[PDB]
Design a protein around this nucleic acid. Sequence first.
RNA 1: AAUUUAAUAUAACUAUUAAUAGAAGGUUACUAAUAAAUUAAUAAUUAAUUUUAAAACCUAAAGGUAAACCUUUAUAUUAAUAAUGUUAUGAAUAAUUAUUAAUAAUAAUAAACUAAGUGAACUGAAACAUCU
RNA 2: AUCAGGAAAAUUAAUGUAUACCGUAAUGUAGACCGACUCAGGUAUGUAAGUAGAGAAUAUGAAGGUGAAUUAGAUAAU
RNA 3: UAAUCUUAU
Lengths: 185, 235, 52, 52, 159, 15, 130
Amino acid sequence: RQWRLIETRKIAKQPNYQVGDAKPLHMPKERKKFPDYKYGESNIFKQSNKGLYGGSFVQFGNNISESKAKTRKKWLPNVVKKGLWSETLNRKISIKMTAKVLKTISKEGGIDNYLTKEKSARIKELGPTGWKLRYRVLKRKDEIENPPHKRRRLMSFLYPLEKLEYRSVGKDLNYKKFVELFADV
Amino acid sequence: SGSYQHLSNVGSRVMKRLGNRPKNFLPHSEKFIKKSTPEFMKSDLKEVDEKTSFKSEKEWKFIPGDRVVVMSGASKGNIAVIKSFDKRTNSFILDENGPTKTVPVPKQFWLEGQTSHMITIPVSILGKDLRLVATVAVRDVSFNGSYYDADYKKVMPYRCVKGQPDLIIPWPKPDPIDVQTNLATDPVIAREQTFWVDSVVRNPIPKKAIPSIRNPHSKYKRGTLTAKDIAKLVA
Amino acid sequence: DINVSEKIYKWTKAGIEQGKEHFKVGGNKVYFPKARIILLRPNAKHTPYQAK
Amino acid sequence: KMTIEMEEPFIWPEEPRPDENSFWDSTTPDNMEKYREERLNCLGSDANKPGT
Amino acid sequence: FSNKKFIRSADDLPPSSHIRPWSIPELRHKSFNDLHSLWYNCLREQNVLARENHLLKNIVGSTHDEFSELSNSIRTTMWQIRHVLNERELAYSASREFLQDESERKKFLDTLANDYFLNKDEVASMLTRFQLAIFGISETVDINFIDGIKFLANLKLQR
Amino acid sequence: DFMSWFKRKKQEEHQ
Amino acid sequence: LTRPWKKYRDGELFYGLSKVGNKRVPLTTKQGNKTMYKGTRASGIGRHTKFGGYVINWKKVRTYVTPDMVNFELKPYVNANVPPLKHEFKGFSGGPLDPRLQLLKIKEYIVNGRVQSEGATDTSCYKERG
RNA sequence: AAUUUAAUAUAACUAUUAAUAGAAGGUUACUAAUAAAUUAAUAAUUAAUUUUAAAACCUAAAGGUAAACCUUUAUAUUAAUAAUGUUAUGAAUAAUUAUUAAUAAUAAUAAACUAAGUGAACUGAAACAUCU
RNA sequence: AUCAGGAAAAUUAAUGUAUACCGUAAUGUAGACCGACUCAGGUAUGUAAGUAGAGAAUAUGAAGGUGAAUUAGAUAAU
RNA sequence: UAAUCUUAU
């Protein structure tokens, strides 16, 4: 097979922003939660952006009679709503799937496994939703593997002292501001 | 007129279109203007655009006050002290000895001591048509050095005869501007220093004055990025 | 104690007496105003105590 | 256009005579305008017609 | 009005050769209050001309434009004044920024100490000027003021 | 040009 | 007759020159319905009341602050006998906004104490450092 | 020294070919301004290059809106202090003004080409449905 | 009576309140809008002397506002 | 009937 309707897609190349450079005119309010999906978000069978369609877009072709009188028809995939169990998330995740995709999931032995397969083909035939799910699972796995220590209290201890010092000079100091200051330190 | 147009800038695009007429339809534009103007007003010379206008005293080869011989005309081989240049036309108005035209004039513009409506008036003439004098006429003048003039109060160039640069044609010393006006501040007060850069702590002009001085909501002045902002931007 | 219009009138009188503003001065301080005004000739409908 | 009422009166200075002031003298520009109107709107045998 | 005249004649107006607008450099060494006064004088002059100009254009339908030229010239001076006011503020801000960089400030202090202070062949006057210049100490309280006091004490100890 | 010339002539007459 | 000099039927209108024209031209305050309110950027001053009134907010009202001691000797023009001054900032890339230059000026002030420059002292001067 | 032919402009398009690089309108006015840096060449010029100022409102997206309007208020807020200032048995309450800190916003930006999704009818077939 | 008759936006008390902007002409049963025209067409509302009367019908019409971008004669046939 | 699956809170 091929992933033509996926890998044809192109997204505007964001310029790498240096810390000292000037701002863009429209900077967003809330930050980027998820990683950027290489292949954007489908602009044709937008039905499939909400689910795990397995790179199965709608076809259009011809109904043909005994007289060979051609008439345009479309061929939809066998989509199905299906709440499937994630071991990593410890909850079942309900989404639209192609019956094919459900079969693949069953073969691979789980939904998390399906999401996390490292092949490029899989990545292509994950949606934007599928990509987000993958990210959620992978991040959770990483957390499970590696808890922070294998600092917050120190910051909390120092904060009031820092505030007092600021006041003695003359200025007031908030927590949030303190946190912002001492993130990289 | 009964206009009110002068207190605004209304119909701006239309005005621009009219003002910036294409140059290949310039004869069309000026034909009707010529017709409109009376004989005593209208001039033969082309009204050049402000781009191609002699603003510098190098661009003008001659200044009001210097003595010039006329040629390529009716009153040719005639010495004349040039009285004042016209800015729009790029030309000079000479004294009585220069080129003139006799034209009828209304009693609104009559000089004291006139019998007839007919009056001789000086026509404008280009710098190309007339050559300097010093008696010896000068073929062409070139500029090589520069200096501060005492009378003119400008860093003017040295008018040198073309070829031999040491033969300097000096500038004509202008008339003394005896200034007695209530709207012109005198030399002593105009230049007296009342400010000095002293304080780093106190800013010189107050905080409430800043909004007049510059636009605080300027769309042009872009903000600089931070680390947090970068992190927010990038996935 | 007294009505609003009367209070305003009293304030105005006080300001006149002072040689201060006969009106509440605002806070939006314009140091370098660029606005010009054209004093017009008086119409028949106006008095000598008016200016437009 | 904003009219104001003020506590002291005022009357403008009297406008100058045609001979006195150079600028305040509407004869010339009006005449010029008339001449322009004549010349642009002159068509055929009104070219021979003497000027006003 | 100007000398209670309905309209300034050609002779009553200031001639073009005698009059010049202000130079930006000339404006640059004038005090704030002086500049403000100049601006308001300019504005007043414009108003006088604007009244007159309007009368000329609306009623008589002239194209003499001396008043308009004068108004333009005044407007030029005004924007130049505005520019120098902005420029001075910017220069101050730049100086502040420079001082905020600590090493540079220290170097500047050292330079000051070497040449004019602590030397012979006035000092008190220099100190009083320096005090005002660099710190918030005239003859109220802040970290900067404290720092200046400490510096002064250090200088006294040295001398 | 003419207007300017006329003005100059007037000025000369005056002085 | 509408106008007595025009006895006969020329194609002249009852008023104006042409009835027709570009309809697509921005609205003014005079045009539109009773409900149509254009406004003239004059009054973002106070606040509209619940009942339809208005309440001025004086901290958001324009005053025009004039200097208390007006220097009347400063005039809109300078005497043309004075030359136009010219500053020079050689050895300063920033120019008049150069912080180094400002520091130098401050140092000079500290040393000397409000000494007038070449141009300020001598009116015949045309070029200057500061 | 004059005129004349041809060539050359800030002052045409179109077509080919070679080289090259891949970009504000409008409205009306409290009009919307610019300052400088050395280098070389030639005290002032001039080139190039670096920087810098101001730039109203509108053009879908602070939020409206019947484009150039209106509403909102960073000449704000939160403080802290400074001082004249008040209820108040210094003293805790506020009132400005003034500083300083800290907290935000600022989409007009092409068209052609390219890629992809969808995908005709007339017409051709001397008709016409397959086909085009 | 049946035909069953909109929506949606506190209280005292204390303390304020130096009064924003915008429409304002004339035209509107029309020559000043819509009808290609100064077009017998179209164009919303309250008033709308008195005397009459059932009445805003009909007569008149105090006041008001008009008498018009064709006149002057002529008045055959039609 | 923890396949689908409607509704409500």
